[PDB]
Design a protein around this nucleic acid. Structure first.
Ligand SMILES: Nc1nc2c(ncn2[C@H]2C[C@H](O)[C@@H](COP(=O)(O)OP(=O)(O)[C@H](F)P(=O)(O)O)O2)c(=O)[nH]1
Ligand SMILES: [Cl-]
Ligand SMILES: [Cl-]
Ligand SMILES: [Cl-]
Ligand SMILES: [Cl-]
Ligand SMILES: [Cl-]
Ligand SMILES: [Mg+2]
Ligand code: NA
Ligand code: NA
Ligand code: NA
Length: 326
DNA sequence: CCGACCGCGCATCAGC
DNA sequence: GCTGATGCGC
DNA sequence: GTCGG
């Protein structure tokens, strides 16, 4: 937070471009800038100093001067004053409601928490659950609770089949003292890039977790990706914990490393690394790293036996999880 | 300039 | 039913 | 909104 004022401003701007303007590239532009600046080990003294960093162009440079000078940005002040932008921004905070749905709702006169509640009829399943736990999903999860959640998940998975391997990724794997949710990578020997010898692999796990009342709701669920809600069990007479978002990703056992690299993130770190890969002539997804041919087409998967091998391919020194928080 | 900006699973819809 | 595009999210 | 060729 050495330059918290600036990164917050930029993040607010990114959110604006994304939710209201629906200008995803501008959104990422602001995010990257915010990211490179949050990483800057100095208290920025001017937009010019900031422009030296890659990702900070002329536009952001001027805004940083305005911010440093007056402690604010007129562009944002006006944005906050605009009722439609504010309503749209607010609705996009409900899981399941994106820029389009948000603007649509606002067009229908549905602009507040109260409006959503008296209009469940107009929401799809995901949006419905997102509204239900609106407040809870806003809360952070202390690492202490992430540790309790981890323990339940690994043990419950073990009970279903001893060969399952569940790895908690996301900010948790990066050493964060608090996480926005829980991310679980799952593998089983019977499921490889080569074949699927057992059906319902992800289902059995989800099922077991619902059985012990850890998983409470489902936002979306497929053969390899579960997106839902969970809650730690509370003791007698004590207030129950907030409900939490949980994502479970089943990846081919032989593609673990690409999978854990992907799920560990951060999201921006992934974007930068994938972008660098391309420049180096490779393409990286959660399953493999493949070279790009002369035609610019993905070739066959390259051999990977550790997260480091992926880093070596694109000529990047290895970065531990804790240093990938961009 | 000007195009590139990561890559993909699930839910939903239109069009057949 | 299917396929493909879109929205949304990670 | 920013960057590289
Ligand atoms: N390539 C790519 N990868 C993405 C993207 N979004 C999320 N990811 C990856 C990396 C996250 O760590 C991981 C989990 O997604 P996440 O949204 O839970 O992020 P996270 O790192 O856990 C956050 F810090 P928190 O949840 O604690 O607030 O999913 C994306 O847009 N592109
Ligand atoms: Cl854009
Ligand atoms: Cl401001
Ligand atoms: Cl791998
Ligand atoms: Cl692949
Ligand atoms: Cl680490
Ligand atoms: Mg997470
Ligand atoms: Na710059
Ligand atoms: Na949302
Ligand atoms: Na998540």
């Amino acid at each position: 937070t050495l330059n918290g004022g600036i990164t917050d401003m930029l993040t607010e701007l990114a959110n604006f471009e994304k939710n209201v303007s629906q200008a995803i590239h501008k959104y990422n532009a602001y995010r990257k800038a915010a990211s490179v600046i949050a990483k800057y080990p100095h208290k920025i003294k001017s937009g010019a100093e900031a422009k030296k960093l890659p990702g900070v162009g002329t536009k952001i440079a001027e805004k940083i001067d305005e911010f440093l000078a007056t402690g604010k940005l007129r562009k944002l002040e006006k944005i906050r004053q605009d009722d439609t932008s504010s309503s749209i921004n607010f609705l996009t905070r409900v899981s399941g409601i994106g820029p389009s749905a948000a603007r649509k709702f606002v067009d229908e006169g549905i602009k507040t928490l109260e409006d959503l509640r008296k209009n469940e009829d107009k929401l799809n399943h995901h949006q419905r659950i997102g509204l239900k736990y609106f407040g809870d999903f806003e809360k952070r999860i202390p690492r202490e609770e992430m540790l309790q959640m981890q323990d339940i998940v690994l043990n419950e998975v073990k009970k279903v089949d001893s060969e399952y391997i569940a790895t908690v990724c996301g900010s948790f794997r990066r050493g964060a003292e608090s996480s926005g949710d829980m991310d679980v990578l799952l593998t089983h020997p019977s499921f490889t890039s080569e074949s699927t010898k057992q059906p319902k692999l992800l289902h059995q796990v989800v099922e077991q977790l619902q059985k012990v009342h850890f998983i409470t709701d489902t936002l979306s669920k497929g053969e390899t990706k579960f997106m839902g809600v969970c809650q730690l069990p509370s003791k007698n007479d004590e207030k129950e914990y907030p409900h939490r978002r949980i994502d479970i990703r089943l990846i081919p056992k032989d593609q673990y490393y690409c999978g854990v690299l992907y799920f560990t993130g951060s999201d921006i770190f992934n974007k930068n690394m994938r972008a660098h890969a391309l420049e180096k002539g490779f393409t990286i997804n959660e399953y493999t790293i493949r070279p790009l041919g002369v035609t610019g087409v993905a070739g066959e998967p390259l051999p990977v036996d550790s997260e480091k091998d992926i880093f070596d391919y694109i000529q990047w020194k290895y970065r531990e999880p804790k240093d990938r928080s961009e």
